[PDB]
From a paper:
GroEL is a molecular chaperone found in many bacteria, whose expression is upregulated during stress conditions, such as elevated temperatures or high concentration of oxygen radicals. In the current study, we generated and characterized 13 IgG2a mAbs specific for FtGroEL.
The final Ab64 structure contains H chain residues 1–213 (except for residues 128–133), L chain residues 1–214 (except for residues 152–154), 34 waters, and one sulfate. The Ab64 antigen-binding site is a shallow groove, 24–32 Å long and 9–19 Å wide, walled by H2, H3 and L1, and the floor formed by L3, H1 and part of H2. The Ab64 antigen-binding site is made up of mostly polar, uncharged residues, including seven tyrosine residues, four of which (L-Y94, L-Y96, H-Y35 and H-Y50) are clustered near H-W47. The FtGroEL contacts include 6 polar residues, a finding that was expected given the polar nature of the Ab64 antigen binding-site. In the docked model, K344 contacts the antibody via the lysine side-chain, which sits in a pocket formed by antibody residues H-D52, H-N54, and H-D56. The mutational analysis showed that substituting a glutamate at the K344 position of FtGroEL abolishes binding of Ab64 to FtGroEL. However, whereas all 12 Ab64 contact residues are outer-surface-exposed in both the non-GroES-bound heptamer and the GroES-bound heptamer, only 4 of 9 Ab53 contact residues are outer-surface-exposed in the GroES-bound heptamer, making it unlikely that Ab53 can bind to the GroES-bound heptamer.
Author numbering:
A (entry chain H): 1 to 52, 52A, 53 to 82, 82A, 82B, 82C, 83 to 100, 100A, ...
B (entry chain L): 1 to 30, 30A, 30B, 30C, 30D, 30E, 31 to 151, 155 to 214
Write the structure that this text describes.
Amino acid sequence: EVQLLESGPELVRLGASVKVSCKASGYSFTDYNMYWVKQSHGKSLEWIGYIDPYNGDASYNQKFKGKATLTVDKSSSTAFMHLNSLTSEDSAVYYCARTGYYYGRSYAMDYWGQGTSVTVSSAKTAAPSVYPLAPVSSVTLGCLVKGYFPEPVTLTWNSGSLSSGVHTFPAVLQSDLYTLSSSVTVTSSTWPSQSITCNVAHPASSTKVDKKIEPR
Amino acid sequence: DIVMTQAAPSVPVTPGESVSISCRSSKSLLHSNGNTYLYWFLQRPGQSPQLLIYRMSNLASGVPDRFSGSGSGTAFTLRISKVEAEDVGVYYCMQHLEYPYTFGGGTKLDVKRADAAPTVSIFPPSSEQLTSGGASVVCFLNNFYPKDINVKWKIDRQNGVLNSWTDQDSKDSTYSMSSTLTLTKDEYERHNSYTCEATHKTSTSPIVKSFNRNEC
């Protein structure tokens, strides 16, 4: 199975630069061109350019000419994308993706990495404050992750064991700060007869905390 | 630049029936070598894009037989026969003929399941949040269909509301929304009742979930 593993999320100051990486496995890295794609928050897709890991020649999109630079490391089977002088319009998700080539024909972007979210902002990393959401047949519980920056944050309930009946909602901004929300639904005979907490981890601020849902 | 156009932004489809996603290009994608360099990609919710069809009519590895690709030189069609619940996502077309490579706007596929009423649960602000000032009133509306639904906040109708939707679920084809009334400790403790009115197509009168500040 072909695997493309990309760099983690990044927070970059305005005007600064970032270098995202894409480590390939499951095939000979130098045999195929690595494409790069920008996806904006409106989920629209743009082709940035590609790099031939062998000779190292790279073709670029005219719009991203001068902003993107593609390189490669054969010793670690990794493609890299450098983006300089970043602005708010550069805040997006960037994908790398292999393009197959067999017997004279091409297979464009046949396998994609998980993507790398880039955030361009002057704001500083703020730690989240998590709050247990207790209620006032089946009872729903909640966990509120409010006031953190930047994305992302991981959320589980019983250390990942309780996965079914969970709705973890996308983060939304409010005055330059993210708010995350999640709700778990279980039978009335399970709570509060059985304990259930909330595992929230914010790596950018290095914060991992647990909040048991307590009755009011 | 070649401009790819997908006119329909969304197509409502009941499971078991066929769908056609259209894509037109500003120029013929027919190459002298006989192939047509049109590409279909799929992006499932929360996932990376995946190759669906390469060069107009060829299915990528593992792609269900239900999918097929056709077209002339300008007009192209992705026929998805017998839609399943896991076909939900955005379908993009892409031309691979000329530089720079360009993508369509994308067509969101929504599965038309049986209408489901929202399960509403309201949650008073946690004690931990009131201690540090500020009070968030959280309201969940889970597993409903269609997506169209209005959420109203009656205190004694105000603003400062932060809404968030999940994508259509891959399994049960439903939607979920998390509405959060963000208030201050001084504004919260000044008023008493807090209701979460929800108006949906599957509803006589709206669904109401409420509480009062000093009752429990």
